[PDB]
């Protein structure tokens, strides 16, 4: 039975292709993050004691790192997701040039949010 | 039988324009039908056609089929069969509207009718003012036509054996053609397709030359198969060299460029076509425009550069808008293969081997013809031809622009339209014996066993160079006699050529060797014929016989394969709906 060339490592991918493979990853990650975020939010409400116990957890550097990633993943999914929707509604052109241009602006808008995320967590 | 047998009413060898129309038609007529093709149907040469289809639709200005019949008969230099040409031009319009109804995406006039453009050899009132009757889709018409015909075959659930290579015809002990053997390219399996009607529709053979507008797959397979079957070929010396191929590339730029307002310039910037053809100018017959450009070069009035000797084709004055709208195809072609942007600078062109006027002689029905010992016509039972592989002949010694596509459709249709009566008329054919089938395989078996023979690469190159230097636009008696001798030599070398790749899973090498056999037979029948015709008519141009000889050569030449000798057939000059156009002096 026959072989197929699907060796992902031997293929060029444009910035637009990167843009959405990340959108997919960021989405799956956010799905997990919601349970983790809920588990935390639940703690920080049950009692005055639980809240201290939570902001204690948020003190840990290892936690602060994860928390920033989680927020950066969500940041990305939102920005790139709005980019997507903008095409679906005709505010963005579906040409290749316009795809590259918007994929870049997405990345920049995300890096700026990612920082403002670290600042919120530091 | 030690070989699978696949039986059909009709087997159509070839899936380009003519073959797909014929398949489509035969099928809707009740009969079973196998469509064979050595490439995927939409990769056939027809896809590369640009200009459009010539047909008296009368959309652009009021027209008349007889005007078109005149243009053709004159363009053919009076060896086109008038009864068939009458059939074509007259039927044309309906056959072409039929395509539009199949969805073919033609370009449009303001009122919403099929766009038509001026083209080479098109007059009103029997040789009058210039006409514009070539219906087109931009300059991608061939592409539009072929893809439409495929979809029509898809819709119609036609049986298509894609990427199967027809080897050779199969003859019953009565001399009737009862199908053919074919090699499945993917798996390597060899099968016998058994048919009451084998329709050859294998296209041209421009690859017997060194430079051609033809695709790599145009290797005259049909001519070879026919010759080896004992079936004569006709007018094989009439090879049309398109005036404007891209210099140093061979890739065609459409005659639509000149039909839209472009003209040819030489090194001094003279529109030299007004000299060679006062009335029609750059839209004169093709054989004429070809020679003119070649003369301009042959006297140091040609231009030069990285492309080689060439003439300049000027378009820029039509404006970016018109170029991008009416001729976007040659924009990419000229940019890609000439590094010239036709919007600013002229395109470097030179006549290039383009279309094969010759081929298997047929009646309008599509039935293949041979001659008996008395020289009279006889029908080859079971054999048919349509398209470029056929010589009907509607093009005589020079084909008109847009007239090939018309041909494909009209005669592909006709062949199917008349297939029932053809089969009934020929009567039941006796079965092929096992050794009859075994014979077809001989050619293939040789290659499969020859390991230490000659290099086919060198043999092909020798062949092409030979035809290029000896049977090009201008011919002389000496060269042709020597070319012919070198061919005999080259052809000996080939009987001992080697198949370096022995495998069976998609072995393209075996195919290309099988093809070379046909390049050979074709090249040979062409050379033997070009010698034979001791005059000058249409494309055929001899220095040692510069005059058109209507007393001895108002006829077709016929190449008898068994005796490797030449002979003649009458040109028909009896239309049915109007009086024949008498042969007169032909100038543009």
């Amino acid at each position: 039975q026959r072989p197929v060339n699907l060796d992902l490592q031997t293929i060029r991918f444009p910035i637009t292709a990167i843009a959405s493979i990340l959108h997919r990853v960021s989405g799956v990650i956010t799905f997990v993050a919601v349970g983790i975020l809920l588990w935390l939010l639940g703690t920080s409400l049950s009692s005055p004691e639980g809240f201290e116990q939570a902001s204690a957890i948020m003190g840990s550097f290892f936690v602060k790192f994860i928390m920033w990633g989680i927020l950066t993943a969500l940041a990305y999914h939102v920005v790139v997701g709005i980019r997507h929707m903008m095409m679906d509604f005709g505010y963005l052109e579906e040409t290749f040039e316009a795809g590259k241009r918007s994929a870049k602006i997405s990345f920049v808008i995300t890096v700026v949010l990612s920082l403002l995320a670290g600042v919120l967590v530091w | 039988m030690k070989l699978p047998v696949r039986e059909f009413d009709a087997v159509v060898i070839g899936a380009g324009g003519a073959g797909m129309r014929a398949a489509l038609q035969i099928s809707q007529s009740g009969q079973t039908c196998a469509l064979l093709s050595k490439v995927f149907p939409t990769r056939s040469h027809t896809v590369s056609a640009q200009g459009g289809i010539t047909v008296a639709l009368g959309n652009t200005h009021e027209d008349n089929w007889e005007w078109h019949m005149y243009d053709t008969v004159k363009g053919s230099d009076y060896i086109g069969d008038q009864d068939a040409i009458e059939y074509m031009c007259k039927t044309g319009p309906e056959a072409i509207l039929e395509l539009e109804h199949m969805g073919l995406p033609f370009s449009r006039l303001d009122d919403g009718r099929i766009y038509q453009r001026p083209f080479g050899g098109q007059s009103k009132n029997f040789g009058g003012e210039q006409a514009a009757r070539t219906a087109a889709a931009a300059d991608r018409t061939g592409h539009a036509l072929l893809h439409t015909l495929y979809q029509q075959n898809l819709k119609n659930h036609t049986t298509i054996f894609s990427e199967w290579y027809a080897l050779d015809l199969v003859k019953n002990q009565d001399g009737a053609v009862v199908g053919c053997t074919a090699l499945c390219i993917e798996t390597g399996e060899v099968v016998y397709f058994k048919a009451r009607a084998t329709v050859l529709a294998t296209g041209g053979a421009g690859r017997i030359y060194q430079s051609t507008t033809n695709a790599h797959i145009n290797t005259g397979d049909g001519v070879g198969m026919a010759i080896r079957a004992g079936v004569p070929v006709q007018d094989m010396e009439m090879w049309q060299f398109h005036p404007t191929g891209i210099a140093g590339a061979g890739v065609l730029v459409t005659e639509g460029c000149r039909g839209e307002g472009g003209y040819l310039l030489n090194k001094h910037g003279e529109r030299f076509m007004e000299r060679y053809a006062p009335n029609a100018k750059d839209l004169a017959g093709r054989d004429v425009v070809a020679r003119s450009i070649m003369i301009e070069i042959r006297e140091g009035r040609g231009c030069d550069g990285p492309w080689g000797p060439h003439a300049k084709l000027k378009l820029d004055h039509l404006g970016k808008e018109v170029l991008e709208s009416r001729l976007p195809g040659i924009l990419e072609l000229s940019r890609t293969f000439a590094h010239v942007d036709p919007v600013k600078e002229p395109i470097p062109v030179i006549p290039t081997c383009h279309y094969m006027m010759g081929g298997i002689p047929t009646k309008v029905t599509g039935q293949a013809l041979t001659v008996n010992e008395k020289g009279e016509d006889v029908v080859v039972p079971g054999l048919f031809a349509v398209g470029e592989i056929a010589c009907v002949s509607v093009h005589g010694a020079n084909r008109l622009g847009g007239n090939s596509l018309l041909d494909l459709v009209v005669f592909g249709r006709a062949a199917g339209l008349h297939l029932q009566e053809s089969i009934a008329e020929q009567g039941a054919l006796r079965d092929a014996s096992e050794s009859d089938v075994e014979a077809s395989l001989d050619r293939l078996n040789r290659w499969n066993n020859n390991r230490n023979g000659e290099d086919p690469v060198a043999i092909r190159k020798a062949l092409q160079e030979c035809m290029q230097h000896n049977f090009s636009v201008f011919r002389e008696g000496d060269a042709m006699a020597k070319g012919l001798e070198q061919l005999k030599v080259i052809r000996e070398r080939l009987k001992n050529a080697r198949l370096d790749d022995t495998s069976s899973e998609f072995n393209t090498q075996r195919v290309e060797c099988l093809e070379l056999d046909n390049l050979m037979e074709t090249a040979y029948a062409t050379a033997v014929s070009a010698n034979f015709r001791t005059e000058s008519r249409g494309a055929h141009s001899r220095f040692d016989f510069p005059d058109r000889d209507d007393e001895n050569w108002l006829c077709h030449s016929l190449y008898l394969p068994e005796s490797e000798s030449m002979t003649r057939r009458s040109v028909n000059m009896e239309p049915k709906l109007r009086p024949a156009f008498p042969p007169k002096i032909r100038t543009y």
């Binding site: 072989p3 197929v4 293929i11 292709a17 795809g99 | 639709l57 495998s503």
Partner: protein, 238 residues
Amino acid sequence: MRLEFSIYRYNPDVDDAPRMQDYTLEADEGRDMMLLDALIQLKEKDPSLSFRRSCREGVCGSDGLNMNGKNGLACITPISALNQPGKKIVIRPLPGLPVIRDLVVDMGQFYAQYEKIKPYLLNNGQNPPAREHLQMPEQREKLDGLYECILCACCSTSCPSFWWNPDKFIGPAGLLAAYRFLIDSRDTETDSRLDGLSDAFSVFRCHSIMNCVSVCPKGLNPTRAIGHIKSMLLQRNA
């Protein structure tokens, strides 16, 4: 100047699995050539090398290849666009399709998705034209950028969504053809067509990755086409 290639090889009767083989070609320094030129010449030196090609002018769509990681046609990719000092020119089959032999893939599923969208004019025969169907230049333009497709398989074989569901997703090439009949004024089956494209896979598997656009040798834009199809689909079922 010398040219170095690394080409995908595979023959079921000999090769246990596929493999990359090295090739060298002496190239006329001054002149530039097309990849297909090289391929044809390599075959003279090694007659076993199988690939497809016909028109050699970028129209037939035969010779689609993954060249240096990206899809395109050998007959119109210049050597000078693939050549970089110190690295071999890497040539592999189009991604995702079964490999028959060497650089030849099995286009089966590609054609299959094409037929699925019923790629032929469907006119119900009412109000027939006196002669040709009358189509105003304005309407005819809507076909532009759609009818020129050469079914070369470049776009679809570079689309992940097609990789994962080559038989449920139509792919760029196909959806382009579908739209080509969806906006043909002469086609009277527009709604029936749309109803066949309303499931979750046919059209909607597309995320706007835009690989399709960047590879099309005819410069067509399957992304925009699929865009229009989605509008029509919402217009109809929303």
